[PDB]
Each structure stands twice: as C-alpha cells, then as structure tokens.
Amino acid sequence: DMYIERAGDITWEKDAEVTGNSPRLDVALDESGDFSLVE
Amino acid sequence: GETTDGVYRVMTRRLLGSTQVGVGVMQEGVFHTMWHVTKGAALRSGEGRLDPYWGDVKQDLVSYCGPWKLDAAWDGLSEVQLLAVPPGERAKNIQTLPGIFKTKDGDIGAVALDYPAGTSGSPILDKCGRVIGLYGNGVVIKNGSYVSAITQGKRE
Ligand SMILES: N#Cc1n[nH]c2ccccc12
C-alpha cells in the first residue's frame, strides 16, 4: 500500500548550490520506457 | 486528503519499515509522478484515495485524480533547479545547466545529478518556479554516473 506525505513548496531558490555537468548523449528509448546509450 | 499544491514523498509500508519509493507533484488537484514509482497502483493521502487517471509506460509518467497538468518546457539555454526530495532527507534545490539526450525522435534536456532511486519523480523547475519535468528516468554513462531525462507530459 502506497501513501503520500507533503515535502515542500515548489519554488526557485536564489543562492542554491550550483553543480552537475551538461553532457550531450545519443540515446534510444525502447517500448518499455528504458533509455540506453547509442554508440 | 491533502490536496495542497507542492512536492510529496511517495511511501510504502509493504517492505521493511516505511520506505520511500519516489516523489511527485500536486498541482491543480492532480498528483503527477513517474510510472516506475507506483506501477499505476492507487495512492492514499490520509483517509483519502487517489486513483490513477492517465499513464504511459513508454513516457514513464502517471497522473492521479485528473489529466496531466504540467506543460512548461526547458528553454534549451538556461540553468534549472532539481527540487530533490531524497529518502529520509529534507527537500533541497540544486541548480544545474542541463545537457541533452539526442534521440531519433528529437532532443530532450537531461540533468547530470546523482540521487538514490527513491528520489524519482522530484520536479525540475525553471526560474519562474514552473515544473518543466520530473527526474528519475535516464541512463548510466561511461564512468558510472547517472544522467536523467527532463521527462515532461502533455497537457490535453
Ligand atoms: N540506476 C540508477 C539510478 N541512480 N540514481 C537514480 C535516480 C533516479 C532513478 C534511477 C537512479
């Protein structure tokens, strides 16, 4: 059995931690909704 | 139950203790999450019940109580924020410049941020606070790191 609990408001935070790169990847999406890399 | 707009944790008591299987967005009376989080099962909100209304395994999305309401899109240029809601941890905004998944059917924004699987369904927002998609369906790249698509539905 599944249940939901509130975790917060959806707002943009000024001064949030900035991280993560921006890779450009060739990908394929199958009928089951799984992404895979194409090479 | 609770119908206030916001981000919510998706929990189950079927396994050991209370386990967080994912996250979702409540907007305009509709709960939005990823299909792999609930598998289309009913949800409880206090004494209330949330029934699935629309879903698609290929998009990996599902809406409850009504049709998908989120229609904002990443502009292809600006930084965005993942409003990450990790299991047992407070909601935290993380800012990043999305990369891109190039597919045979077009390009999709992608966020290279690594969180536990139970963080799936956490919203990705633009600078106006609009939800441009959900985090949690993506790929494992060469060095073992995770890259999620910015998954967005269609507002009918
Ligand atoms: N494999 C894998 C994952 N690592 N981190 C995730 C976050 C959301 C969904 C899946 C994963």
**Domain range list for chain B:** 6-64, 80-149
CA distance B2 to chain A (A): 8
Query: Does A15 reach chain B within 8 Å, measured CB to CB?
Result: no
- Please report, for residues A27, B16, B99, B102, the alpha-carbon distance to residue B5 in angstroms, rounded to integers and kept in the order given: 33, 29, 28, 33
Topology classification of domain B6-64: Thrombin, subunit H (2.40.10)
For ligand 1, what atom is nearest to the CA of residue B140? 1
Any idea which architecture B80-149 has in CATH?
Beta Barrel (2.40)
Give B29: exposed, middle or buried? Use CB within 10 Å, 0-12, 13-18, 19+: exposed
Experimental method: X-ray
Q: Of B94, B106, B100, B114, which is closest to residue B149 (Cα–Cα)?
A: B100
Answer yes or no: are the C-beta atoms of B122 and B134 closer than 8 Å: yes
Answer yes or no: are the C-beta atoms of B85 and A10 closer than 8 Å: no
Q: What distance in Å separates the CA atoms of residue B74 and residue B131, rounded to the nearest whole number? A: 9
Q: Of B137, B131, B150, which is closest to residue B32 (Cα–Cα)?
A: B131
Joined together, the tokens standing for residue B114 give 């690594």
| CA B30 to the chain's CA centroid | 13
Type of residue at B6: G
Q: What distance in Å separates the CA atoms of residue B21 and residue B78, rounded to the nearest whole number? A: 30
Instruction: For residue B39, give the 3-state DSSP assignment.
Output: coil
Q: B21: which strand partners? A: none
Resolution (A): 1.6
- Please report, for residues A20, B55, B58, B97, B142, the alpha-carbon distance to residue B146 in angstroms, rounded to integers and kept in the order given: 11, 25, 19, 15, 10
- Please report, for residues A33, B47, B71, B156, the alpha-carbon distance to residue B139 in angstroms, rounded to integers and kept in the order given: 11, 37, 24, 28
